[PDB]
């Protein structure tokens, strides 16, 4: 009759059992917070205590197998729950040892949504009436606290959207400190006391409606086509009306929790394994790329992998562990035949691995240095449109972007595979020449197939070919039926009775291949020994045969038309199966039938980004021209017309306000940031004033005025060119796209002439 | 007849077997380097190839158990080695399948010294003649390469001392790039080709001498008192004569390798578990403290544990993994009764753990923030003498200091224990009042026991008491015999038949204690249930007894005089066993019989540091006074006496060289660094000149000259005070030490009034 990590309430199971509540803590950290709150003593006389309140741990807890869960068995035992009986009446519910169960879990993705979702699913499966009658409850701790200097009482928000609405109408949010509490352990000692002072206010009840029954069957108890539609749309956050309705009665519908908290957890797991089709990288790889750009921007100096990994964790908010971070960093710099990256983000300094072990023979991160490939990165990922991309915010801090939009589709140009046994994803890189022809035809108006390609977009004609890349592959790519096959190369020495394997299939490691041949009993009866004399980045495997075994091979493998007998005796061919699964930029899962669809879907995103880049540049140039013209006009209208003897902020302001000097916002026009065109327009015009008078005396000289006037002419010439670019026949920024394609191609050619070293 | 990760040489085992060599690679990364070098083809016609050369892996390999090693069995099989036969003659050695075995291991501590030391020990144990006749060899790759711009040929050094001698006489080492190769994976593609172009030059042979036989028995095959003396002295690096003798004949004595490479590996493992008695922290904790000071120096802003852990890895060269780093960071900020740190380095924001689980209930590093305790750290670890401490250099980059010398001995003031099952180390914190009395008496000349204490230092009288700290412990500390015991507190309710435990022993977790009582069958027969209603940082455990079991207890535990029957029925007492094992600052292991010896040994180090601080400050002040006097004298001897129309570096130099302006070194006098007094004297006087003429015109004004003159008087007054401090009766800087002791005490009192929050 014992349960681990369970503290019995004093009144539990007695006459006052219905007044007792069971706190289901997520883990040990949650238990410590509950123990502190439940034992405040005389400091919180009205707060909960160990009277009418108990604790139990939900550690682990991760259908016949469902009943074997030891953690869930303890919850049933302590609550007095009985199977085969439905708690449809109050008198039957009075037999339970506790009045209700309250789940105290973190408000993160690996919190409510997974631990709480399973608890709701477990109760719904066996005792639906308990959820209907409010037996299952949730402790809704504050998510965001805003602290202002001079005030000891913060402003607490239970949802992200609540803070966004409040911050929008809070004018300048400079004197306020914003803290995010995604886990129960994030609360300070004084914050815990405040939460338990109003403990009853943060207890929320779960309600079961008609829509929740279908949702429970989809998310839980089902791993089939039913879940596909739910995960193909993304997470829709709760609206303001829904949030206010929840707080009005402190009742949370089960459907709303599943649609938001549970779905987001499901999508997060997939996003860690499935890349986005816009750039073909997962969120973990984005932080490495975004961190790599930031780390090596000031100086492109060699850094150790573990040293660079610390930079990514410190700056890009990477908290999944250095073991996965260092491995991903190493994979981002590996360059060998059959490597995942045909165009590595980083430059590999040292032994980063080899094709023989499939990159598993990489050196230790302590001795292995890394360096950013500046030439390739600065062209494939332009820095001028990086401000335009949406950015992931981690606890209110800017992190790696939501997605990258490279000049060429990287989801097609690289080899991709997910080691995890779930949501299969395999991508075979298409050759650069085919991809360049398609993109150039789409953008260049003078291309002979420019009109034909645009016609083929709406009808999926696919006039131009897309073929697997044969770079760093001295084999054969043959298309039989609807699948491509990569064939290895072998040499036969009749006099020496030795078969030499000079090439393996496209992505077959040497060590794994030898094991597959060696473990085949039927094939090994013709082989006495296998010797691997292969060099780095080349295959040379000597297969020694029995004295009279070469002849016997041809009558046992039948000499298939598609596969040679030696190519059948030795597994020298493989099928290039593609599982084109990707995550949409807005959220969800998208399925692509062909590599053309991925390229066709990526084109609009890059097309509008060029228009967005020019439109924002046009807005910035107009603001800069106005500011510089006013500064130049100020020199011509200097102390000779209005002196600066006033030397006061208000007093200098009105004297020229009649003249007509605009109160433009400095530090924003000179240095734009991640600000949209609409956001820039309001802040620039309706901002501060102090951009004049703050200049030194030498700027008023005739020589100093000349450079400012010349600067205006330079910006005016640029402004006229931007207008011409916005009016191009195919779409705005078509010529800019073509120029950047050539720059990317030159960087790739330069990186291919060397071993992706560039120096 | 198969061996994993073994590539057979073409001539191995044949007529040319003696010309073949077996390369024993440390791991997969080493194998990749060997494969690249051995297959350079026509690019290296004279280099080694797969002819007369093979590879084998030493992965794992970590006496009856020695013979069961699968990895070593493969080496014996491929070499044709036979037991029970001694290779004392050439004809017997001709039966081996390879001429020699060459170990290709990293030049780091977890390289040669451990993997190579075991290989040498294995051969020495069974076939000593093979080492005598040169069968065992080592591949000595370059350790340090120095690259200078404009030259493609670097300068290679095989030892750290070789580079130090070369860099000492290389004048300004500004145009040279220094790279460290502590592992085989650190070599670039072009460096590997260079190494294998001269492969025979980097092959070194091991020689066995008389002294090596005893050393092999000590380091290997022995875990007893014999190893104690070897590890009590530290590592002595090879001298210049020894290094030159090794390179002259390419023969490495086995004794030299064991005394340097193997001993350093042994000491490194101990240093990761045993702290230094000067500050009571290991090398891992030093990087956290040194990183914490650097991270929070600019702004003391809250940072996540994983975010701060990335900073330590990136800046303090921490490469042992974030799992150990995050755990150590959390332990550095835990503050609860029975915690390891009575004076945590950091301020714990969030749930950092509790006494019930012994700190194991800490929150996830993602949700847990950390903040430096600036008030305590800036006083206990002064920043002005941090430049004086020796510093660990990782690959030529400055890292955390070799040791810290705090104002008070932290090795005595904190609780310490090593979880690892080796080199037992347990420290029980002495109370602050006893420690303050001892240190103050030693430093203050006016203390009544100042003369008595100094007399007691040389005779170990120990006039002043040292007692275990009772802070955050509502129990009893009783000294019986030669050991201290901490007793818990209990309450007995006769009418309720419940025993309430209001206090546990000093360092006994609540959860572990209940398990110990619950697992005792004899004790559990009187207990029906145990309920843990304890609050945070307080103990309240209800023990429910059988109706007639309280009486029976007293006749079964006999009511020992030292231990009460209830204190015996419930394990409410423990022995404060102390294992005072520490690592010496210079290296080695030191054993302390009593806590007085640790305090007595720490005193000289802190005493000389104060003298070193004042002596360097005196030297800096003299240089600053000379520079400022020259600048002031320059204003009085301005263009009126010598103009600056010359405007050339050489031309302006000689015109005032007759006047007598010294060519002082700027950017060093103004901003001292980790430079010794002797180093500072040479560089300051014999440096550059450009400290005059580089000042702006306003500095020559009469008002500007006045502040410079006033600044000289301020420095002159400080210089006179420093001379007075250096002539104090007990020792230089005695009053400075007393002032800093009060500052540390005030910070501790302030941190104890709060819950180590300070705000």
In this structure, how many other beta carbons lie within 10 angstroms of the beta carbon of residue A377?
20
Give the CA radius of gyration of chain B.
33
Q: Does A676 touch chain B (CB under 8 A)?
A: no
Method: cryo-EM
Q: How is the beta sheet containing A303-304 ordered, strand by strand?
A: A303-304, A369-372, A346-349
Instruction: Classify strands A489-493 and A498-503 as parallel, antiparallel or unpaired.
Output: antiparallel
List of domains in chain B:
6-141+181-271 (3.40.50.670), 143-175 (no CATH), 283-411 (3.90.199.10), 476-575 (3.30.1360.40), 602-726 (1.10.268.10)
CA atoms of A495 and B20, how far apart (whole Å):
27
Between positions 44 and 103 of B, the ones with CB within 8 A of A are 50
CA atoms of B342 and B355, how far apart (whole Å):
13
Length of chain A measured in residues: 759
CA atoms of B103 and B22, how far apart (whole Å):
8
Decide if B513 is catalytic. no
Q: Which two tokens stand for residue A514?
A: 């030898």
Of the candidates B143, B81, B135, B133, the residue with the CA atom closest to the CA atom of residue B111: B143
Please, where are the H alpha helices in A425-530?
432-443, 450-459, 510-518, 521-524
CA atoms of A354 and A332, how far apart (whole Å):
14
Q: Does B360 touch chain A (CB under 8 A)?
A: yes
Torsions phi, psi for B129 (to 5 deg): -65, -30
Q: Which residues contact B590 (CB under 8 A, 6 or more apart)?
A: B232, B277, B581, B582, B583, B584, B601
Q: Does B353 touch chain A (CB under 8 A)?
A: yes
Of the candidates A156, A216, A199, the residue with the CA atom closest to the CA atom of residue A180: A156
Q: List b or e across A277-316, with b for residues whose CB sees 16 or more CB atoms inside 10 angstroms.
A: bbbbbbbbbbbbbbbbbebbeeeeebbbbbbbbbbbbbbb
Q: Which two tokens stand for residue A186?
A: 């994030």
In this structure, how many other beta carbons lie within 10 angstroms of the beta carbon of residue A329?
26
Of the candidates B473, B534, B467, the residue with the CA atom closest to the CA atom of residue B507: B473
Q: Which residue has the tokens 């061996």?
A: B3
Q: Which two tokens stand for residue B230?
A: 């070897």
Instruction: Classify strands A303-304 and A369-372 as parallel, antiparallel or unpaired.
Output: antiparallel
* B183–A39 CB contact, under 8 Å: no
Nearest-neighbour CA in chain A from B350: distance (Å)? 5
Which chain B residues are closer than 8 Å to A186 by Cβ?
350-351, 363, 367-369
Residue in A152, A312, A319 to test binding to B, most B beta-carbons within 10 Å = A319
- The Cα-based distances of A138 to A37, A143, A185, A187, A206 in angstroms read 16, 14, 17, 17, 7
Which chain B residues are closer than 8 Å to A315 by Cβ?
310
Q: Which two tokens stand for residue B146?
A: 């120095």
- The Cα-based distances of A453 to A449, A463, A730, B692 in angstroms read 6, 7, 12, 71
Q: What is the CA A642 to chain-centroid distance, rounded?
A: 56
**What's the CA angle centered on A97, arms A95 and A100, to 5 degrees?**
100
Please pick, among B159, B180, B219, B367, the residue that the annotation labels catalytic. B367
CA atoms of B255 and B120, how far apart (whole Å):
11
CA atoms of A136 and A624, how far apart (whole Å):
60
Q: Is the Cα torsion angle B129, B130, B134, B137 positive or negative in sign?
A: negative
Q: Which residues contact B732 (CB under 8 A, 6 or more apart)?
A: B610, B611, B614, B615, B725, B726
Which chain A residues are closer than 8 Å to B365 by Cβ?
319
Q: Does B186 touch chain A (CB under 8 A)?
A: yes
- Helix (H), strand (E) at residue B205: strand B203-207
Contact, A282 vs A275, CB < 8 A?
A: yes
Of the candidates A687, A686, A704, the residue with the CA atom closest to the CA atom of residue A632: A704
- The Cα-based distances of A364 to A132, A302, A323, A724, B104 in angstroms read 56, 16, 11, 53, 16
Q: Is the Cα torsion angle A702, A707, A713, A719 positive or negative in sign?
A: negative
Q: List b or e across A473-500, with b for residues whose CB sees 16 or more CB atoms inside 10 angstroms.
A: bebbbeeeeeebbbbbebeeeeeebebb
* B350–A35 CB contact, under 8 Å: no
CA atoms of A3 and A78, how far apart (whole Å):
8
CA atoms of A331 and A717, how far apart (whole Å):
45
- The Cα-based distances of B487 to B502, B505, B570, B574 in angstroms read 11, 6, 11, 7
| Number of CB pairs, chain A paired with chain B, less than 8 A apart | 181
* B183–A363 CB contact, under 8 Å: yes
Nearest CA in chain B to A349: B188
Gaps in chain A following residue numbers (C to N > 2.5 A): 62
Q: Which residues contact B703 (CB under 8 A, 6 or more apart)?
A: none
Length of chain B measured in residues: 759
DSSP character for B169? T
Q: Does A758 touch chain B (CB under 8 A)?
A: no
Long-range (24+ apart) CB contacts under 8 A made by A77-80 are A77/A1, A77/A3, A78/A3, A78/A6, A78/A8, A78/A12, A78/A22, A78/A54, A79/A22, A80/A13
Q: Does B755 touch chain A (CB under 8 A)?
A: yes
Of the candidates B133, B457, B401, the residue with the CA atom closest to the CA atom of residue B279: B401
Q: Which two tokens stand for residue A180?
A: 């995010």
Q: Which two tokens stand for residue A587?
A: 């959220």
In this structure, how many other beta carbons lie within 10 angstroms of the beta carbon of residue A190?
10
Q: Which two tokens stand for residue B582?
A: 């520490």
Torsions phi, psi for B628 (to 5 deg): -70, -35
- The Cα-based distances of B245 to B141, B164, B242, B251 in angstroms read 17, 18, 5, 8
Q: Does A357 touch chain B (CB under 8 A)?
A: yes
Q: Does B39 touch chain A (CB under 8 A)?
A: yes
- The Cα-based distances of B69 to A92, A394, B102 in angstroms read 66, 50, 19
CA atoms of B229 and B232, how far apart (whole Å):
5
Nearest-neighbour CA in chain B from A292: distance (Å)? 13
Q: Which residue has the tokens 């002596």?
A: B615
Torsions phi, psi for A638 (to 5 deg): -80, -165
Q: Which two tokens stand for residue A59?
A: 């550690």
In this structure, how many other beta carbons lie within 10 angstroms of the beta carbon of residue B229?
11
Strand partners, B477: B486
Q: At what angle do helices A210-219 and A115-126 cross, to 10 degrees?
A: 120
Three-state secondary structure readout of B503-559: ECCCCCCHHHHHHHHHCCHHHHCCEEEEEECCCCCCCCEEEEECCCCHHHHHHHHCC
Strand partners, A529: A544
Residue in B51, B104, B334, B350 to test binding to A, most A beta-carbons within 10 Å = B350
CA atoms of B489 and B515, how far apart (whole Å):
18
Q: Which two tokens stand for residue A303?
A: 């850094």
The DSSP code sequence of A141-209 is --SEEEEETT-SS-EEESSHHHHHHHHHTSS--SSEEEEE--SGGG--HHHHHHHHHTGGGGEEEEE--
Of the candidates B431, B411, B380, B428, the residue with the CA atom closest to the CA atom of residue B274: B411
Contact, B644 vs B671, CB < 8 A?
A: no
Torsions phi, psi for B193 (to 5 deg): -65, -40
CA atoms of B294 and B201, how far apart (whole Å):
44
CA atoms of A122 and A220, how far apart (whole Å):
9
CA atoms of B612 and B733, how far apart (whole Å):
9
Residue in A364, A369, A371 to test binding to B, most B beta-carbons within 10 Å = A364
Burial of B32 (0-12, 13-18, 19+ CB in 10 A): buried
Question: Which among A32, A108, A367 has the least Cβ separation from residue B361?
Answer: A32
Of the candidates B158, B89, B184, the residue with the CA atom closest to the CA atom of residue B129: B89
Task: Classify the phi-psi angles of B537: left when phi > 0, otherwise alpha if psi is within -120 to 50, otherwise beta.
Answer: left
Of the candidates A665, A667, A656, A603, the residue with the CA atom closest to the CA atom of residue A634: A656
Strand partners, B102: B23, B137
Q: Does A292 touch chain B (CB under 8 A)?
A: no
* A354–B39 CB contact, under 8 Å: no
Q: List b or e across A149-166, with b for residues whose CB sees 16 or more CB atoms inside 10 angstroms.
A: eeeeebbbbbbeebbeee
Task: Classify the phi-psi angles of B113: left when phi > 0, otherwise alpha if psi is within -120 to 50, otherwise beta.
Answer: left
Residue in A536, A755, A758 to test binding to B, most B beta-carbons within 10 Å = A536
Contact, A547 vs A557, CB < 8 A?
A: no
- Helix (H), strand (E) at residue A480: strand A476-480
Contact, A479 vs A487, CB < 8 A?
A: no
Q: Which two tokens stand for residue A435?
A: 């991809």
- The Cα-based distances of B571 to A16, A184, A238, B471, B620 in angstroms read 35, 34, 54, 21, 60
Q: Which two tokens stand for residue B7?
A: 């590539």
Torsions phi, psi for B16 (to 5 deg): -95, 30
Number of continuous H segments (helices) and E segments (strands) in chain A: 29, 26
DSSP character for B276? B
Q: Does B369 touch chain A (CB under 8 A)?
A: yes
Q: What is the CA A659 to chain-centroid distance, rounded?
A: 52
In this structure, how many other beta carbons lie within 10 angstroms of the beta carbon of residue B396?
12
Strand partners, B417: B426
DSSP character for B7? E
Q: Which two tokens stand for residue A400?
A: 């790696």
Assign B204 to helix, strand or coil: strand
Give the up-direction half-sphere exposure of residue A163: CA atoms within 13 A in the CB hemisphere: 22
Q: How is the beta sheet containing A476-480 ordered, strand by strand?
A: A476-480, A483-487, A573-575
**What's the CA angle centered on A438, arms A436 and A443, to 5 degrees?**
90
Q: What is the CA B196 to chain-centroid distance, rounded?
A: 36
Which chain A residues are closer than 8 Å to B32 by Cβ?
351, 353-354, 356-357, 361, 536
Q: What is the CA A333 to chain-centroid distance, rounded?
A: 20
CA atoms of B131 and B206, how far apart (whole Å):
6
Q: Does B608 touch chain A (CB under 8 A)?
A: no
DSSP character for A102? E
* B363–A7 CB contact, under 8 Å: no
Between positions 511 and 570 of B, the ones with CB within 8 A of A are 531-536, 538
In this structure, how many other beta carbons lie within 10 angstroms of the beta carbon of residue B414?
22
DSSP character for B18? G
Contact, A268 vs A284, CB < 8 A?
A: no
Contact, B7 vs A508, CB < 8 A?
A: no
Task: Classify the phi-psi angles of B50: left when phi > 0, otherwise alpha if psi is within -120 to 50, otherwise beta.
Answer: alpha
CA atoms of A309 and B640, how far apart (whole Å):
60
Q: Which two tokens stand for residue A616?
A: 């924002």
Nearest-neighbour CA in chain A from B29: distance (Å)? 5
Burial of B1 (0-12, 13-18, 19+ CB in 10 A): exposed
Gaps in chain B following residue numbers (C to N > 2.5 A): 62
Assign B406 to helix, strand or coil: coil
CA atoms of A546 and A531, how far apart (whole Å):
15
Contact, A227 vs A219, CB < 8 A?
A: yes
Give the CA radius of gyration of chain A.
33
Contact, B46 vs B35, CB < 8 A?
A: no
Contact, B567 vs B573, CB < 8 A?
A: yes
- Helix (H), strand (E) at residue B597: helix B595-636
Q: How is the beta sheet containing B251-253 ordered, strand by strand?
A: B6-7, B53-57, B21-25, B100-104, B136-139, B203-207, B251-253
Instruction: Classify strands A483-487 and A489-493 as parallel, antiparallel or unpaired.
Output: unpaired
* A186–B39 CB contact, under 8 Å: no
Of the candidates A747, A736, A739, the residue with the CA atom closest to the CA atom of residue A432: A747
Task: Classify the phi-psi angles of A580: left when phi > 0, otherwise alpha if psi is within -120 to 50, otherwise beta.
Answer: beta
Q: Which residues contact B606 (CB under 8 A, 6 or more apart)?
A: B405, B406, B407, B737
Contact, A740 vs A405, CB < 8 A?
A: no
Between positions 324 and 343 of B, the ones with CB within 8 A of A are none
DSSP character for A5? T
């Amino acid at each position: 009759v014992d349960v681990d990590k369970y503290t019995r309430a004093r009144n539990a199971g007695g006459k006052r059992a219905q007044d007792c509540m069971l706190l289901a803590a997520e883990g040990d950290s949650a238990l410590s917070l509950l123990r502190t709150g439940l034992t405040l003593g005389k400091s919180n006389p009205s707060g909960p205590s160990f009277d009418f309140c108990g604790m139990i741990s939900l550690g682990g807890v991760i259908n016949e197998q469902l009943t074997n869960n030891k953690v869930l068995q303890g919850i049933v035992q302590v609550l007095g729950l009985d199977f085969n009986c439905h708690y449809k009446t109050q008198e039957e519910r009075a037999k339970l040892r506790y009045g209700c169960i309250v789940a105290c879990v973190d408000q993160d993705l690996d919190g409510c949504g997974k631990i709480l979702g399973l608890l709701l699913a477990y109760f719904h499966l066996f005792w639906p009436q308990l959820i209907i009658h409010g037996f299952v409850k949730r402790l809704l701790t504050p998510l965001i606290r805003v602290y202002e200097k001079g005030k000891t009482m913060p402003v607490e928000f239970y949802y992200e959207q609540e803070f966004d609405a409040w911050a929008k109408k809070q004018t300048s949010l400079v004197n306020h400190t914003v803290k995010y509490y995604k886990g129960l352990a994030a609360h300070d000692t004084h914050e815990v006391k405040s939460m338990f002072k109003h403990f009853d206010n943060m207890v929320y009840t779960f309600t079961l409606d008609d829509s929740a029954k279908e949702l429970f069957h989809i998310y839980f108890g089902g791993e089939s086509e039913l879940r596909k539609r739910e995960l193909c749309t993304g997470v829709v956050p709760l609206t303001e009306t829904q949030t206010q309705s929840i707080h009005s009665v402190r009742r949370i519908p089960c459907s709303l929790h599943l649609q938001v908290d549970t779905k987001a957890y499901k999508l997060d797991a997939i996003e860690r394994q499935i890349p986005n089709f816009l750039d073909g990288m997962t969120r973990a790889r984005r932080k490495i790329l975004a961190g790599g750009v930031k780390c090596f921007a000031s100086n492109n100096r060699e850094r150790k992998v573990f040293q660079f990994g610390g930079y990514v964790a410190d700056h890009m908010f990477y908290h999944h562990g250095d073991m996965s971070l260092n491995t991903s960093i190493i994979k981002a710099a590996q360059y060998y035949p059959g490597s995942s990256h045909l165009y590595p983000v980083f430059i590999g300094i040292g032994s980063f691995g080899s094709r023989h072990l499939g990159g598993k023979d990489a050196g230790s991160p302590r001795y292995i240095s890394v360096q950013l490939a500046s030439e390739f990165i600065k062209t494939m990922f332009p820095a001028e449109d990086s401000w335009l991309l949406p950015y992931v915010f981690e606890d209110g801090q800017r992190a790696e972007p939501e997605y990258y939009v490279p000049v060429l589709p990287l989801a097609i140009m690289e080899y991709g595979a997910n080691p995890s046994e779930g949501w299969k994803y395999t991508t075979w890189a298409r050759q650069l020449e085919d991809i360049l022809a398609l993109v150039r035809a789409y953008v260049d108006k003078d291309n002979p197939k420019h009109e034909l390609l645009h016609y083929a977009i709406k009808h999926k004609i696919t006039i131009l070919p897309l073929r697997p890349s044969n770079y760093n592959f001295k084999g054969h790519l043959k298309r039989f039926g609807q699948y491509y096959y990569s064939y290895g190369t072998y040499d036969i020495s009749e006099q020496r009775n030795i078969i030499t394997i000079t090439e393996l299939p496209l992505r077959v490691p040497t060590v794994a291949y030898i094991e597959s041949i060696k473990k085949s009993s039927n094939r090994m009866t013709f082989i006495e020994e296998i010797i691997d004399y292969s060099s780095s980045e080349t295959i040379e495997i000597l297969v020694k045969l029995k004295p009279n075994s070469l002849n016997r091979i041809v009558e046992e493998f039948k000499e298939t038309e598609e596969q040679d007998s030696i190519e059948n005796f030795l597994r020298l061919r493989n099928c290039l199966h593609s599982h084109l699964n990707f995550v949409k930029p807005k959220g969800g899962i998208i399925e692509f039938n062909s590599y053309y669809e991925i390229l066709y879907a990526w084109l609009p995103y890059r097309r509008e980004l060029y228009q967005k880049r020019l439109m924002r540049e046009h807005a910035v140039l107009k603001l800069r021209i106005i500011m510089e013209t006013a500064i130049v006009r100020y020199i011509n209208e200097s102390a000779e017309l209005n002196l600066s003897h006033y030397e006061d902020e208000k007093e200098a302001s009105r004297i020229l306000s009649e003249h007509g000097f605009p109160p433009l916002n400095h530090t924003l026009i000179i240095s734009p940031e991640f600000a949209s065109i609409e956001e820039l327009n309001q802040k620039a015009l309706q901002g501060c004033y102090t951009y004049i008078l703050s200049l030194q005396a030498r700027e008023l000289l005739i020589a100093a005025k000349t450079r400012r006037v010349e600067k205006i002419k330079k910006m005016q010439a640029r402004l006229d060119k931007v207008e011409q670019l916005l009016q191009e026949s195919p779409f705005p920024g078509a010529s800019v796209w073509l120029e950047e394609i050539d720059a990317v191609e030159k960087a790739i050619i330069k990186g291919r002439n060397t071993q992706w070293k560039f120096h």
